[PDB]
Amino acid sequence: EDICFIAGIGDTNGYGWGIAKELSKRNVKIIFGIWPPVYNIFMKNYKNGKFDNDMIIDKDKKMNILDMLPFDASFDTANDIDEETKNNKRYNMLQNYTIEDVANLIHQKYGKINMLVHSLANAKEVQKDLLNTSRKGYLDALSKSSYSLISLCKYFVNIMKPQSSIISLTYHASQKVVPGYGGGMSSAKAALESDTRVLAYHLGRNYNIRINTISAGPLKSRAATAINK
Amino acid sequence: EDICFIAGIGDTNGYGWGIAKELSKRNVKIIFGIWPPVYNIFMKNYKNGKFDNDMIIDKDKKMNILDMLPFDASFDTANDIDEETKNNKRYNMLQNYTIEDVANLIHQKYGKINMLVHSLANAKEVQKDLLNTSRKGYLDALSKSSYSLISLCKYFVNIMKPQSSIISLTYHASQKVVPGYGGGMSSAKAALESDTRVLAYHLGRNYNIRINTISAGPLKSRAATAINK
Amino acid sequence: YTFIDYAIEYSEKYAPLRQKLLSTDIGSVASFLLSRESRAITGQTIYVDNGLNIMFLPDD
Amino acid sequence: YTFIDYAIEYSEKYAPLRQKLLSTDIGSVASFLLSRESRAITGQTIYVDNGLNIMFLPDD
Numbered sequence: 001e002d003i004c005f006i007a008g009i010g011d012t013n014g015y016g017w018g019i020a021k022e023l024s025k026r027n028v029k030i031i032f033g034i035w036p037p038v039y040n041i042f043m044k045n046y047k048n049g050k051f052d053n054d055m056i057i058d059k060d061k062k063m064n065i066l067d068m069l070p071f072d073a074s075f076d077t078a079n080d081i082d083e084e085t086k087n088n089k090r091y092n093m094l095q096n097y098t099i100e101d102v103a104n105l106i107h108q109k110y111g112k113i114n115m116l117v118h119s120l121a122n123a124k125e126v127q128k129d130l131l132n133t134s135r136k137g138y139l140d141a142l143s144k145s146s147y148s149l150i151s152l153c154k155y156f157v158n159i160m161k162p163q164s165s166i167i168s169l170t171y172h173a174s175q176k177v178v179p180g181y182g183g184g185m186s187s188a189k190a191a192l193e194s195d196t197r198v199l200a201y202h203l204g205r206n207y208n209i210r211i212n213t214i215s216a217g218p219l220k221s222r223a224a225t226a227i228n229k
Numbered sequence: 230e231d232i233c234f235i236a237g238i239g240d241t242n243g244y245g246w247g248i249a250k251e252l253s254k255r256n257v258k259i260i261f262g263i264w265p266p267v268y269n270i271f272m273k274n275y276k277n278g279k280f281d282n283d284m285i286i287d288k289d290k291k292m293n294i295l296d297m298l299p300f301d302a303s304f305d306t307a308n309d310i311d312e313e314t315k316n317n318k319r320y321n322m323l324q325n326y327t328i329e330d331v332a333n334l335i336h337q338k339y340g341k342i343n344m345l346v347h348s349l350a351n352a353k354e355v356q357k358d359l360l361n362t363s364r365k366g367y368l369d370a371l372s373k374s375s376y377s378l379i380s381l382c383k384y385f386v387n388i389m390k391p392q393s394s395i396i397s398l399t400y401h402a403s404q405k406v407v408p409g410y411g412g413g414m415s416s417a418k419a420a421l422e423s424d425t426r427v428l429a430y431h432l433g434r435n436y437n438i439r440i441n442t443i444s445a446g447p448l449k450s451r452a453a454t455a456i457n458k
Numbered sequence: 459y460t461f462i463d464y465a466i467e468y469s470e471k472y473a474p475l476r477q478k479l480l481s482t483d484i485g486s487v488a489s490f491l492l493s494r495e496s497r498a499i500t501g502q503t504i505y506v507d508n509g510l511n512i513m514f515l516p517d518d
Numbered sequence: 519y520t521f522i523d524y525a526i527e528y529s530e531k532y533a534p535l536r537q538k539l540l541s542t543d544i545g546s547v548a549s550f551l552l553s554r555e556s557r558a559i560t561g562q563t564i565y566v567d568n569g570l571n572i573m574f575l576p577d578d
């Protein structure tokens with residue numbers, strides 16, 4: 001009986017899905033955190049059987065999806081939630097999708113978990129190069145793709161068993177320049193990779209919990225296609 | 230039906246042994262290459278069941294050891310054996326212990342294998358610090374601890390299936406200074422971590438074989454103790 | 459053909475390992491990292507990229 | 519009391535992970551690397567050391 005929250009999935013073409021498939025090989029219960037703007041699209045697609053083939057784990061099991069929850073890594077607690085998204089067509093019919101709200105929901109419904117996956121990133125200005133990126137744009141890259149990992153950790157540690165484990169995904173652009181990977185996404189990954197260490201000391205010393213990040217090579221997912229050079 | 234050759238077991242207190250235990254858990258077949266200085270004594274102890282408590286994989290699993298072979302990583306082919314060591318008390322009785330020879334032996338008894346482990350090091354002057362290491366000792370450290378890997382690869386690469394995987398052990402003193410890790414041991418691990426990349430290029434492109442290195446924390450093995458500090 | 463198609467094409471031409479990189483390739487690594495099998499690894503950036511990250515210069 | 523005893527002591531005091539580091543802790547990582555589960559990883563130095571290598575300064 002092991003549970004893994006995977007934060008950051010909008011379809012089955014990304015890394016979050018591959019991670020779900022392989023965890024299933026080990027019978028782990030999977031809970032998805034989905035960015036609200038694409039949560040209803042996702043539920044519909046799922047309900048309409050678009051993911052059935054993609055759910056089959058070779059070994060004649062279906063992916064065991066415990067639950068699928070709206071989740072927005074821009075918002076730590078209920079009172080970070082700004083008015084315009086409170087009235088946003090996509091958000092206002094969903095509730096409890098801030099990082100703290102979903103920690104609580106999950107804990108209330110299923111108890112403690114022992115596996116956490118950060119697998120999301122965003123940067124409004126990824127199409128611009130670093131030099132031409134604005135403060136607002138840069139900081140959104142960092143907030144959504146880097147701070148989001150710290151915040152996840154802080155809220156979830158409390159609902160996780162000790163010896164539990166945490167990953168996130170990164171890209172080599174943090175260490176070696178890849179032109180096109182703009183908007184401060186490279187900066188964000190640099191920070192993410194350094195925060196993984198610092199988080200590892202704190203989580204390690206205080207909770208005996210582990211944290212690492214995987215630097216993946218390229219896959220044609222939604223966000224990857226959204227880069228565009 | 231996986232088979233692993235583990236190069237560098239002398240007792241059950243090292244990483245070699247722990248690697249053999251964990252590999253058993255997966256039911257992979259284990260073949261040991263033992264250094265002739267400790268070979269007869271390792272065999273003897275094994276025969277007397279000294280290793281019986283040690284071969285216990287909790288799960289009512291006994292370690293399964295396919296074979297045990299004499300093996301010296303200083304020697305590439307039989308023509309590299311100098312007369313003196315050829316006549317030595319410890320080596321005189323044994324044969325087929327060069328890197329080339331054990332490859333062939335293994336390939337005759339059992340066919341191609343698919344896992345290879347390099348878990349060995351040596352350096353005549355480990356006790357001396359880098360500045361005070363002689364040419365001879367330095368070159369010994371690289372020969373025994375770094376080249377041995379490359380050469381293990383040249384020969385074993387032909388008795389391994391495509392998709393096979395090779396690993397060695399390293400230590401952080403290659404990247405950061407630990408005084409007392411002398412003899413050019415630090416140099417040898419730096420070289421070994423560099424050769425791990427180069428070889429991964431050649432092995433990947435040409436054989437579809439992977440190689441990595443594990444940088445382990447300190448463990449109280451026989452070799453560890455022989456560093457008088 | 460955009461940026462990701464360049465990166466995938468470069469990777470598949472130049473990475474030590476020739477095979478197509480699957481999300482499940484990353485998945486089996488995350489699986490392992492999330493398990494007790496890796497109890498002694500933490501604070502690491504682990505590269506799952508068919509080795510591309512080790513190359514300096516191309517061959518073509 | 520030797521070099522290796524200083525090493526163990528320092529690591530058990532200062533590493534992110536406090537557990538004693540075991541031969542079988544490396545062994546299981548070795549096992550994963552050797553298996554197909556790591557088919558996209560090559561050329562790497564993977565640290566298995568309770569995270570000691572990420573530390574710059576002690577605290578105490």
Ligand SMILES: NC(=O)c1ccc[n+]([C@@H]2O[C@H](COP(=O)([O-])OP(=O)(O)OC[C@H]3O[C@@H](n4cnc5c(N)ncnc54)[C@H](O)[C@@H]3O)[C@@H](O)[C@H]2O)c1
Pocket residue numbers: 007008009010011013014015016034035036038071072073074118119120121122144169170171215216217218219220221222223224
């Ligand atoms: N695709 C690649 O080639 C590649 C390479 C290296 C690293 N990565 C990393 O993998 C991770 C997953 O991305 P992917 O490439 O599989 O694409 P993806 O589109 O599958 O996943 C990214 C997800 O982040 C979600 N998201 C965006 N903003 C959010 C927010 N504010 N709150 C909550 N969720 C949000 C999106 O809905 C999307 O589902 C990312 O960290 C990415 O940087 C990808």
Ligand SMILES: NC(=O)c1ccc[n+]([C@@H]2O[C@H](COP(=O)([O-])OP(=O)(O)OC[C@H]3O[C@@H](n4cnc5c(N)ncnc54)[C@H](O)[C@@H]3O)[C@@H](O)[C@H]2O)c1
Pocket residue numbers: 236237238239240242243244245262263264267300301302303347348349350351373398399400444445446447448449450451452453
């Ligand atoms: N123990 C540690 O703290 C530690 C830390 C990091 C890395 N390592 C590395 O792990 C590897 C294994 O070392 P260990 O600590 O298990 O010590 P060990 O003494 O248990 O293992 C070394 C073995 O290699 C064998 N050997 C030495 N020279 C040989 C040769 N020329 N040919 C064939 N066999 C030979 C010895 O017989 C011995 O059994 C080494 O590469 C070491 O550098 C050890």
Ligand SMILES: Cc1ccccc1-c1ccc(Oc2ccc(Cl)cc2Cl)c(O)c1
Pocket residue numbers: 120121122123124126170171178181185217218219223224225227461462465466
């Ligand atoms: C850009 C690139 C080049 C080569 C390999 C991977 C990648 C790559 C693809 C998608 C990636 O994911 C994202 C990239 C940018 C943004 Cl805005 C969001 C996400 Cl999820 C990534 O971080 C890197």
Ligand SMILES: Cc1ccccc1-c1ccc(Oc2ccc(Cl)cc2Cl)c(O)c1
Pocket residue numbers: 349350351352353355399400407409410414446447448452453456521522525526
């Ligand atoms: C020196 C050290 C400091 C802290 C932790 C481990 C180690 C450590 C112990 C044994 C090691 O293995 C050897 C070191 C030197 C030699 Cl001559 C042979 C071996 Cl097998 C090692 O590479 C590193």
